[PDB]
Every structure is written in C-alpha cells, then in structure tokens.
C-alpha cells in the first residue's frame, strides 16, 4: 500500500530475478495464497531467532573431533594468536575452552566482555557456548597445519539486520471422473494429432484416456468428453491431470492439479499454455503453465462434476519381506513384492528402511486404502524414535512420492539435522522442492526457516534459488515465491550484501558474454581480445560497480576492487574470464574468480556437493582423503563462477613443461615439479603424503560417480601436493586416472610395489569400503541430481551405473579385490586413454 513499499517490491524483483507480483501466467491464486501462507513461518523464525548469534553466524559442529586431527593437538592445548592493532601475542588454550573462557584468560593476563573473536581477513566469528574444538575454522586450520589468527573485534550491531514491518465432500460423490477436451491452438507437413489425458499421482498413472486423431492444423477442435474409470471420491490429494499432445511422438505437455491448494475439486473452464518437448525429467511434473503465450500450443478443457476433500507372520514370508527391505532404492518392486508389503504393513512399519517400499506399494487411486495408510502412519513409534538416516529420508522426498503426509514425516526427520549438515544437503533439498505437488509445502517451509535461522544457510539458499529461477521457466514461479518469503526475513544487512553481489555478477556476466562474442570459436586469444577486456573492465570499475561485495561461493570473504592488470581471458574454447580482485579486509594478495559461459555449472555444483558428502562419510570412519572442494556457483543458463585455488597447476601443463605440445609423457615430470616447488625436504616429504591421500580419494570418488575417465588437463595439483579435478560440466575406456607419472611419486616403475604405493592402496580400498556402507545415500543423491540437474537423464541405464559400481549385494572381501582390479586396469592402460584424450584435440 505504501509508496515506498512499492519500491521494496522492485528491489525484491531485482534480487530474485523474477516479478512475484505477476498474474499473467496463473490460472488461480496458488502462488498468491502461498505468499500470504509463508508470512506465518517467516515471522515465527524472524521472531524466534536470537539476534546476537544471528548477526555473528558462528560456524560450529557437534560431531566428535576426528582422530587424525587429534594427533595435531599433542599437548591437549592449542595455540591462538590474538591480534589487536600492534598487539600480537599467542595463547595456549584447552580444546574444551569456550570463547568466553578464553576472553577471561586474555583480560586477566593483561593490564570488557563487549569484544568478540573474529578471524583475520574474513567475517567469521568464534562466539557462543561451544568448545573451540567444535568451531569449523579451528578444525580447518588443524587440517592444513595453519596457525590460528584472530582479532579482538567489536561485535556487529544486531539492529543492522532489522526487518521491514510485514458444500459436499469428495468421499460422498460416487460419479466417475470426466474432462471435456474442447480443442488445441498452435500459433504455427501433413501429420496427425491426438491428446492423451492421464490421472497421475507422482510417477504412477492411475488412468488414461485418449482422443481420436485429427489432422495437424492451427486450431484443432474436438469438444469431447473423456470418461475415466476413477470415481471422484477416489481422487487423492496431489493428483495431476496430465494433458499430452501426440504426433507416435510426444510434442507438448501441461499439468493441472485436480484437487487445489484449498482441498477443493477443481472445476470450470481452463485455457492451458503448454511446454514443448526439447528436440525422466522433473520439469515434466510442473504445475506451472508455459509463460510464452506467443509461441506455445494451447489446450482448452472443461470440468464440473462445491466438492471438498476431507482431512502373526510365518518365518518364510518374514524372510521374503526382509530380503525386499534389504534391496537398494533402485531395485524395482513387482506386484508380488508390493502385495506382500501391504498385507504385512504393520510388520513393515517396524523397520524404517522399508518405508520407501511400503509407501511405493500403496493403491493411491483408492480412498479406502489411502485411509488405511493414514491410520498406519499414525502408529509412527518406530519412525519418530529411529536414528536419522538422511539417505532414507531423501528417498521419501523424491519424484516417487506426492503424498503430503508421507513427505512430511521425512521433513520431520530433517528437523534433526544441525546447520552443518543442512548445508551439505541444501542443494539436494532445494531440487526436491521440484517434486512437491503444491507451492507451499513442509519442505519449502523447512528450507525457509533454516535459511532465516542461519546466515550461512541463508546466503547459500539465495544462490541456489536465484540459480533455478534464472534458468528454469518450469519452476521459477514456485522458487521466487520462496525466495521472496526468505528475502523478507534475512534483515537489511543481508538484503544489502545480496544487492552488491547480484549487481557485480550481472555486470561481469555481460563482459563474459561480450568477450565470447568478440573472440571467435576457431580463434586463439589475440591482442584485440585481451585489450578489449581490460578496456571493458576499466569502465565497470570507474563508477558502475560496487567497491565491495561478498564472494558468492565463500561468503566470509569480501572482495573489493578489480586488479585489472592481473585479469585476462582463458585459452579454453569457451573463453572464460580469469579475474582477480583485491581483498577488502586490511586484517596484498587477491581473490581469483573464473567467470564462464558455455558449460552447465549445475552439473559442476552437483558433483562438488557429493565430494563434500564423500569426505564427510570418510571423516566419520576416521579417514581424510584431502579432497579439494573448490567453490563454484551457477548463476544462470550455462553461465556461472569458479574459485581459483591458490598456486595450483594443471597436470597436463606440468608435463608440457619438460617437453611441450606432444604425446611423449614422462613419469618423473610430476615427481620433479613437486621437489622443485618445495623449500625443504620436510615440505617435500609432506607433499608426497598430501599426494598419496588426495590422489587415493579422487580415484574412489570419480569411480563411484562415473567421471574417472577425464583428460589430465582437467586434473590440477597444488605446490603442496594436493591433487584436485576441475570442469565436471561435460558428461576406449579407463575407470579413473592413475597414470605412470603419479606412480613415480609413490615409488613404482609399474607392476611393482613400493612402501608408499602400499600406503596408497590401503587407504584407497578402505575409502571404497567406507562409501559402500552408504550405498543408498550415494544412489539417491545421484538418482535425484539426474531427475533435476542432468537433462540427458535415462531412467533405465544412466541411473544404474552407480549400482554396478558400488558392488551391490556383494561381500566386503570381494570389494577389496574388485577395487584393486580397477587399480590394475590403470596399470595395463598406462597412457593408452591419456594419449587418445590428447588425440581428441584434432
Ligand atoms: C579451480 C581452479 N584453480 C586454479 N588455480 C590456479 O590456476 N592457480 C594458479 C595460481 O593461483 C592464482 C593466484 C591467486 C588468484 C590465488 C592470487 S585454476 C582452477 C580452475 C578451473 C576451471 C576451469 C574451467 N572450468 C571449471 C573449472
């Protein structure tokens, strides 16, 4: 209503990248009702959260301090360098010392509580009643053997985060369901079309009726009643009326929810703008209609049937039911299996791992059965009590489940995750919103309240939602209605940082797309393209870009002015921008960021998230495989950013040092580069230990994912011997890369065993074992990222690579040999595929 409240909605639309106050693409108030419906949990969180802790966002974890990291604390007391101006005197504190206790041990050891421990060079705070061992920044320093540098700083003002003042039933109706297909209208040789109407409940198709084929014209009228066998009483909440135009080839689709957001049966006249098939995918389930009215095929339908929706086993069969529960998520159930799970549903409820299969075997098109399922769900004693299995929880949030009650018990288990884990699974929990039948949901409300509770979760939430909105027309309506709901609770300070970030990304994306236009595809980096970049960049800095911004992939870091003398264009075919920015904290080395158009960085983000999940799985088994999970955020269509890792070099560039652009690869090349880049033999004998652990980790990780066969120009290594892979936005043969240059560093010529190669295969095989223990988790993370992120998704063979790879249904002893067989494939191949990878240049 306020004249300035209208200017707030245009700031929101600039941050979101979509106008939520738009009704040109809706046939009901589903999104408007969701906007108002979210005010309640937004305000409950904004009110619930403590302001002094929300402002300083302490990054803690309640997981035990790992064994390898404990070895670094040999004195049961670690060093903390506290700095204030000139002062820079260290302190020895016990790992059980709260930052409050370490405050009394700094003031009493000097000659008041209004000072906090802030890390040097970042906006990261060691505050709150949590032991110093549980702070992430402390654990990060103990991993990379770095010294703890803090500052006696003034705490931020919690008032900076201020917020702006914000009839019959179905079960009585015994008639059959019907829908009149009036016609189809395309704006614009000699084929036929027919329409197919389906009653769907997630994946499962309850009923199906088609029209008679009629010639392919601009307007095709039918005016026909399609009668279905399903009674109106039997329609479940979340039932979708999928209308498809077939040429026998699917050309267009559009969904419409039979039961609306108010439990009412949908009736009336509807003119639906349809999506074209690109010439399985989460986008196929979307309730949103095609916004492009000018170029899309339309379908007009009619309904009127108000009507509202109301709210002891033998050993043999036990052995069959247990065998079924044991099988992996992708093992398909048969009618025999489904029937056995249902009849013995009370036995199945006693095992929580049998939840996805028990609910996958429910007759959803039968009111009577869904009513039994809801009574069955009330006996949730086992479920509530049970330990949180995130892998199992996520199965219940995928495409196979449209049930609000089924999906909600899963969100109830997610409320147990601490911030630390909510960050690991955030990308995936965000995509799972695509599978929710309705806009307002338990999951949406869950992501909102956690983002609003923690500024680190909030920052990442923003970038993930802003990402899908900027490259998904099927879901931008839903995700923007959730991003507005968040942005209206993060508080003024966040709303300012996001504006500066969005602004910088927008300008640099323009320059990335402009430099790509200038430098031709079949063209190297000339003097024209390099000087045009420095010219374009000077005009941005001189009055059109913020003097400061938080780094999207690492928010604790604030980047400042552009070091234009250090920026350049990369030699890749996609011509990425290598940019360097000066650090914005005085507390002169820059931040390196790569901007890139051309590759799908959602696939990059989805693999990088899985590497943090994998190294977490290992951390619990007291393993550390030094994976370098560099930052990378997708910002729109094929465009996005990548973190430049300090003093790291490509493996292919290391060999084309001894001898340049040629296929004669030496083994000693990498072994020399490591010693040449090491000051003392102590630092070189460390680089081989960082190489053995990091190398073994990337071998197992890429193998389980099916991205082990990579060109060595996409494999980098640091001067400190930390190997890492880059550019995952792509996907004879090889399982993973273990080329003879790497073996030389471990001590083996080939077909030999050295003491370090022995160390390598020991951790290598123990890491495979560790991941095999979390088979269902990896299967679901990959299975879900293919439903949403990877658009070339095969719901048959693509999804099942990880099944064969993860040694399903096999003993742990065979696995040790099988993994070592794949090690020996890389021994006999040597440089066979690496040579053919170099040959892919011409
Ligand atoms: C992840 C990553 N790190 C690198 N590090 C590096 O070049 N260091 C060289 C020296 O430090 C730079 C110096 C300073 C800026 C730190 C001050 S390049 C790279 C990549 C990539 C990529 C390309 C295409 N698609 C996806 C990913």
Swiss-Prot record:
ATP-binding in keyword set: yes
GO biological process, one term: positive regulation of MAP kinase activity
CDD domains per record: C2_PI3K_class_I_gamma (cd08399), PI3Ka_I (cd00872), PI3Kc_IB_gamma (cd00894)
Activity regulation: Activated by both the alpha and the beta-gamma G proteins following stimulation of G protein-coupled receptors (GPCRs). Activation by GPCRs is assisted by the regulatory subunits (PIK3R5 or PIK3R6) leading to the translocation from the cytosol to the plasma membrane and to kinase activation. Inhibited by AS-604850 and AS-605240.
Catalytic reaction equation(s): a 1,2-diacyl-sn-glycero-3-phospho-(1D-myo-inositol) + ATP = a 1,2-diacyl-sn-glycero-3-phospho-(1D-myo-inositol-3-phosphate) + ADP + H(+); a 1,2-diacyl-sn-glycero-3-phospho-(1D-myo-inositol-4,5-bisphosphate) + ATP = a 1,2-diacyl-sn-glycero-3-phospho-(1D-myo-inositol-3,4,5-trisphosphate) + ADP + H(+); a 1,2-diacyl-sn-glycero-3-phospho-(1D-myo-inositol 4-phosphate) + ATP = a 1,2-diacyl-sn-glycero-3-phospho-(1D-myo-inositol-3,4-bisphosphate) + ADP + H(+); L-seryl-[protein] + ATP = O-phospho-L-seryl-[protein] + ADP + H(+)
Sequence positions that bind ATP: 592-601, 627-635, 724-731
Effect of residue 836 to S: In IMD97; loss-of-function variant unable to rescue reduced T-cell activation when expressed in Jurkat PIK3CG-deficient cells
Location(s) in or outside the cell: Cytoplasm; Cell membrane
Main subcellular location of this protein, as a coarse class: cytoplasm
Tissue: Pancreas, skeletal muscle, liver and heart.
Family: Belongs to the PI3/PI4-kinase family.
Name listed for the protein in its UniProt record: Phosphatidylinositol 4,5-bisphosphate 3-kinase catalytic subunit gamma isoform
Lineage start: Eukaryota, Metazoa, Chordata, Craniata, Vertebrata
Gene: PIK3CG
